[PDB]
Design an enzyme around this catalytic site. Sequence first.
Site, PDB file in Angstrom:
ATOM      1  N   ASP A  67       0.851  -1.199   0.000  1.00  0.00           N
ATOM      2  CA  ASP A  67       0.000   0.000   0.000  1.00  0.00           C
ATOM      3  C   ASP A  67       0.884   1.245   0.000  1.00  0.00           C
ATOM      4  O   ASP A  67       1.370   1.662   1.067  1.00  0.00           O
ATOM      5  CB  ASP A  67      -0.875  -0.003   1.246  1.00  0.00           C
ATOM      6  N   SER A  83      -0.575  15.643 -11.946  1.00  0.00           N
ATOM      7  CA  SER A  83      -0.814  15.306 -13.336  1.00  0.00           C
ATOM      8  C   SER A  83      -1.037  16.567 -14.153  1.00  0.00           C
ATOM      9  O   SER A  83      -1.604  17.550 -13.631  1.00  0.00           O
ATOM     10  CB  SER A  83      -2.036  14.362 -13.431  1.00  0.00           C
TER      11      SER A  83
END
EC number: 3.4.23.22
Length: 330
Positions: free
Chosen positions: A35, A199
Amino acid sequence: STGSATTTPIDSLDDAYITPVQIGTPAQTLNLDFDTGSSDLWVFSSETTASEVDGQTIYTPSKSTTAKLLSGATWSISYGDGSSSSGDVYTDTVSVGGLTVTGQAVESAKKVSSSFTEDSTIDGLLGLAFSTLNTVSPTQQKTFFDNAKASLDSPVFTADLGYHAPGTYNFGFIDTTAYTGSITYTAVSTKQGFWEWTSTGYAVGSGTFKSTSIDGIADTGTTLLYLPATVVSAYWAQVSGAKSSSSVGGYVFPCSATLPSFTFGVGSARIVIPGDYIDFGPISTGSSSCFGGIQSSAGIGINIFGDVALKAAFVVFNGATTPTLGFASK
Ligand code: NA
């Protein structure tokens, strides 16, 4: 040193991925959920409340000659999905894919929430976010990566998740055979303890690319892609009959649909998520309403590039003094 381990979807939907991990001496192999959005290595154990164990493999520290209680240490964690676990702490030897750390904090669960009990395939979590998020008190502990780092050939690990197929976590090296083209690296903020990046924008299907900054985290422990409501609405507007269902808890779509791809930007590069990756199947067994793999992050307080996005790429988690992320097509 290096390590290389195969990671395997837990079910036909890729709801999560499990990776075998050796704990203790002799080895006890548990299948952990790696994770990159958390920083605790915790396991089902011989200490876990018996009614909260249903089919998991447990770690028994009393059977490990290298286990030592970390006296006074406790831990307690709550995840984004509402699940939780807590317990006490041992140090022990932990190996992943041939890479060994001695003295790793292994957080032994005394209590787990219902979603953990109900998932027989996940024996615990191995956190790969920054150690500043580790929950051990009163002495915070390091992640497996942070303890391995100095020994690794390169201070990196890579996630290569499969679509409906096994993939790989590598530690200490880039497998230049595992991706196409070049790796585009992008800046990381560690201020929230995550692999947080920005992004450069998105496209829906064959549509034009929208240049827009989207701050979010690279999180292998989250199934879906969670993005701002504007972006998500633009995606599902291209699917006839898709709608946001408050009763189901997100966007659903007709199971008869063919989904468009979703592209996200990494600097000047582009990662394309095929439409098929965005299909999470019937909302309930036999339903013709299917659950979408792109959902709104509104109310979560962060955008999450979970497995739907990451499994479309070869992802480099660069733990150099200034961390960065890399993405390649594959
Ligand atoms: Na679900």
